[PDB]
Write a structure and sequence with these properties.
This is part of a larger assembly, with two copies of chain A (51 residues) and one copy of chain B (51 residues).
Chain A lengths: L4 E9 L21 E9 L8
Chain B lengths: L9 E3 L2 E3 L34
Antiparallel strand pairs in B: 1-2
The structure holds 2-acetamido-2-deoxy-beta-D-glucopyranose.
2-acetamido-2-deoxy-beta-D-glucopyranose binds next to loops of chain A.
Chain lengths: 51, 51, 51
Amino acid sequence: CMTGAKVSIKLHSSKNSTAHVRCKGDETAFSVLEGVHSYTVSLSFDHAVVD
Amino acid sequence: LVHKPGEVVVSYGGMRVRPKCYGFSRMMATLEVNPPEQRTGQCTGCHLECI
Amino acid sequence: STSNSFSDDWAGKMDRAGLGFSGCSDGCGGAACGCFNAAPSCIFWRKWVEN
Ligand SMILES: *[C@@H]1O[C@H](CO)[C@@H](O)[C@H](O)[C@H]1NC(C)=O
């Protein structure tokens, strides 16, 4: 749909922002911060039961 | 004929080599020193949740 | 009873050698064996373990 499906991803590293998520169906890239934090991104899926 | 066992040949790793001089003596050398000094003592960022 | 099979040439006098057993055996004679006499040759052997 329009807004899509939002998925929260948590990371932990020493670098400020070095990340690149790649998967089938949709590709989403975002920026992170130093340390452990919480981030929310949205992807495009074409199935009700996302497994 | 001089009293000696003759020339000596040494094999090392399957190959026969004819050296110039053969002897066993001492020699000043150095050693490897690893000062780790608590490289990774204790550091982790996590959280707990209930379901 | 002589078991000291060290004619001032073996590498047993080291700190990295470890434990072993000073053994000995017999040898052959001839041009292909190393000498020029029809008599067994004294051949010494030393084994040990490493890490
Ligand atoms: C990482 O972010 C901090 C705070 O925003 C900043 O002080 C630092 O210079 C940044 N480092 C790099 C390599 O961008």
